[PDB]
Amino acid sequence: IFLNVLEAIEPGVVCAGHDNNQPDSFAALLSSLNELGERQLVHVVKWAKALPGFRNLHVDDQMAVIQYSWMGLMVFAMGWRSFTNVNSRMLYFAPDLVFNEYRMHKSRMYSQCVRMRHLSQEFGWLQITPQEFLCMKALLLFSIIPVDGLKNQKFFDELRMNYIKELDRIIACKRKNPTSCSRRFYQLTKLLDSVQPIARELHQFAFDLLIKSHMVSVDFPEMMAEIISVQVPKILSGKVKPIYFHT
């Protein structure tokens, strides 16, 4: 019933509202991205709260976990959309905001976009199924926490353990073949680990942009601006860190 729940709660299409009549400029692109980011955050919150066992977490931990993993979750899902929509050729942030190389450059996030596009390609190189994608995204929500722990660490550890086992099942079920399916699990865990460094570059870029937004003329929605100035700094200063499968 796990996979059914994931498929049932999976967010739908989310547009950015980008004016594709305009010629493209740093401000216009980033202003649309920030608006889309706020929109996606709202959907990620609803998605997370409807995940199996998620309400078992302390109230403060629930939001904490969502805010810390928000960027990684967006990276992962967007990498998936790009793979299934345009074969990783471009970055499908939204139906009305697709990034070609010109916008990657004009947005001033080229290196970050290069990393993300590489991630999207991995979905194809590894032949990731829709089901593995859903389970991995779920596990991604439980992959970053304060080094000093959450208000109720034990509950988080139990929930994380259960999602790892669900991923292990979706791999074991009629699909594999050999005796040691440590290979498919190994690469999927490696792929999830690869999201963290990308999220970190996006975190850094988001932080730097918010600090100088006043000049660059870029609006930051209320919720996104609070996460970037309250949550993000904690990740950048080393207080909250990703949980890596491999060292």
Contacting residues toward ligand HYQ, per CB under 6 A:
33-34, 36-37, 40, 74-75, 78, 93, 202, 205-206, 209, 224
Those residues with Cβ within 8 angstroms of residue 78's Cβ, 6 or more apart along the chain or in another chain: 91, 92, 93, 116, 120
Those residues with Cβ within 8 angstroms of residue 181's Cβ, 6 or more apart along the chain or in another chain: 171, 172
Least separation, in Å, of the C-beta of 14 and ligand HYQ? 7
Cα dist. 34→22, 91, 154, 221 in Å?
Answer: 17, 16, 35, 7
Structure tokens at 245: 């499968």
- CB nearer to ligand HYQ: give 40 or 196: 40
Least separation, in Å, of the C-beta of 176 and ligand HYQ? 31
Least separation, in Å, of the C-beta of 205 and ligand HYQ? 6
Least separation, in Å, of the C-beta of 56 and ligand HYQ? 27
- CB nearer to ligand HYQ: give 155 or 207: 207
- CB nearer to ligand HYQ: give 32 or 62: 32
- CB nearer to ligand HYQ: give 108 or 190: 108
- CB nearer to ligand HYQ: give 171 or 210: 210
Ranked by CB distance to ligand HYQ, the top (closest) residue is 37
Least separation, in Å, of the C-beta of 230 and ligand HYQ? 14
Q: Which spans in 194-242 are helix H?
A: 195-216, 222-226, 232-236
Cβ proximity of 229 and 135 under 8 Å = no
Cβ proximity of 144 and 76 under 8 Å = no
